[PDB]
Amino acid sequence: LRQLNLNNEWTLDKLRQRLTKNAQDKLELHLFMLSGIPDTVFDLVELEVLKLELIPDVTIPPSIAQLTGLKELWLYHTAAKIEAPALAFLRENLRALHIKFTDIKEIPLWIYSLKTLEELHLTGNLSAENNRYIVIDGLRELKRLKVLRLKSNLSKLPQVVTDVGVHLQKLSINNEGTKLIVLNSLKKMVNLTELELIRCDLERIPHSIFSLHNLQEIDLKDNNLKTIEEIISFQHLHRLTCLKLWYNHIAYIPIQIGNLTNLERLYLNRNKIEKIPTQLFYCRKLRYLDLSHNNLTFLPADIGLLQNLQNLAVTANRIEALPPELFQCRKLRALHLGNNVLQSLPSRVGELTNLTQIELRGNRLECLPVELGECPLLKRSGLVVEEDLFSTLPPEVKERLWRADKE
């Protein structure tokens, strides 16, 4: 009766108004804390990502044949039983499955039978006595798996991912404070383009990343990296373009980062770096130089050489004066200067054209110069600043910026 009633109450139009969109611009539906799953949800055709959160012991009806645009099944603490025609349909249609569970028995055993699945997000402890990676020993049946997110407190990386990683292209491992004994086991895992070791408390960069060659996006967030001196060997990685060495204990940058000419985004924010060596400023390909929440006191003039820089975020630093050479780079799109100790912003910012959002609120800025209104694409939403600082601009220039807010 309750399942039938849930099918009855959850009408089609209220589901249509319940539809949302995700970060991937796919139609979305979050089912949170229901007795079962409505059949009118399964009657939908435009839905792309359905989100099953806290659904106790439901069975998937075969009416999922109507859910043709369904590609991402999101399973949060949901013990799901499956019908055979719906199992075949999900085998031939479903391509992204995220599994969060509190018990290792909560993960469905039919996820191994899926063949069109490429993205898996196993968040929750896979490491248990006699169930340590033996439950997921069935991901050998998975063939096209390319994204394998593991927020699972893994003490040591599984041998099963060493077996699978020939075809794996992304390995996001979050242990939330447990160190990996990598043992250079990623050599058999040759097809990775992205590696996101987040909150692993590694305290040092392992040599498995160095043995690999195909990586282009390396994230070592919150690994407690006190020293990053190994990066001299990173010239071996000819394809890396995003070295996200943020949220670590990095206090300095070795000069061998100048050998890394292939970097495009260098996310060093929320670190303890106090001085930028000029060798880091050799890399012409840097586009997103985020050094926010750090100990930088001055900005070198060689930043004018970095012509491809777009978003220079030095938020909450000790930079007192911006050099004029900072405005030599004309591609600055988002100058995040907030929470700094900038005494005065030079008028050379009027030469910049790509600037769309500049952050000056929270600074020692005495007054806003008139030339700040010379940027065409800048608007009030982009120009976030204190109201009295906004009032320093001429009412005709203020009219121009208020019009950019309006028009």
Partner: protein, 404 residues
Amino acid sequence: LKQLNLNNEWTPDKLRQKLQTNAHNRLELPLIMLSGLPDTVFEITELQSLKLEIIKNVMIPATIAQLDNLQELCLHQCSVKIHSAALSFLKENLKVLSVKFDDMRELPPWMYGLRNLEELYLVGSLSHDISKNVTLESLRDLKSLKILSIKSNVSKIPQAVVDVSSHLQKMCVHNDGTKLVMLNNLKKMTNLTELELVHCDLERIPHAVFSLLSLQELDLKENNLKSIEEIVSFQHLRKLTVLKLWYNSIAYIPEHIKKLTSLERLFFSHNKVEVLPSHLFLCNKIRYLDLSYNDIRFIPPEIGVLQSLQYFSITCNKVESLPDELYFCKKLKTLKIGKNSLSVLSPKIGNLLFLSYLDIKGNHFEVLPPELGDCRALKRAGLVVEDALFETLPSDVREQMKAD
């Protein structure tokens, strides 16, 4: 049941779409007109501030421990209680507070129990029984309090202010028409740098303000000062660079301002000064001189010493004659002479290479000279002139400031 209904009423999606930014550039939740806090607030762990507006008898759970990014609270007419582990967490995490008390109970006694407090904004309506506030005298617990903005009728300065004499750096009062007395407390400020006594009903400069020894910015706005006379001891405020004395009734500036050779920011706008002194111009260090909407008759020719002056707002004054000595100073960047009593504009203006602001609106002029094209840093948006006088310019002179 109220909390159960509230949790169902306010889903985490609704609070996520409620998210916005505050005036301090922090992620703030403006919870307004509610019975209590929802339990789905703490699922947004990226939050940095909550604005609680008129939410009384609220009990904060320990789940606030999930708000790791939280560093600010803004309590607006909220009689809020907290739980012990939540109290410890906000003691070990919070930095900024801003509590408004329309009623005394809306000011909570728990908020002084923290020690990591840096900035406090004590807006509200304090009773005249100020020294009886033992809740105030708990600011000695705060070992990092540097900003203290009390927007309330502070007749007598608390000994709570005495207990935070050293660690404080910004001190703000909006006394709102009440005389500020018991000066020995403000004498006890040792390491205070910014004194913001806005409308403290000060009939002159208090001796307490002058017993400061480490001040950097003094604001006596809307304080009916009679004179600036004791200045023989402003020389001990060598750290002072900002003097904010506008919207006042001062009628003269004596020579004594020569004592401070580090003065940069000077405010004397909307005052009762009828003639600007030359001995004020004798000081050359002054870079910011504000005298808008004053009653100044004329500028003595000693203003040529003021070369470092980058801001001379004489706009909306009574000034009829402007000497040529002011145009010798080329560093003047922000110059406003709008709505003044001038007759003609000086042709020699081209030496002002660094001149972004020029405002001449409302003032009577006969013919705009071609020498307005001689200004280099001038901009058409920066040169606020009427459309009729915009027509009375040569086309090349029009394009000189119009075309960027």
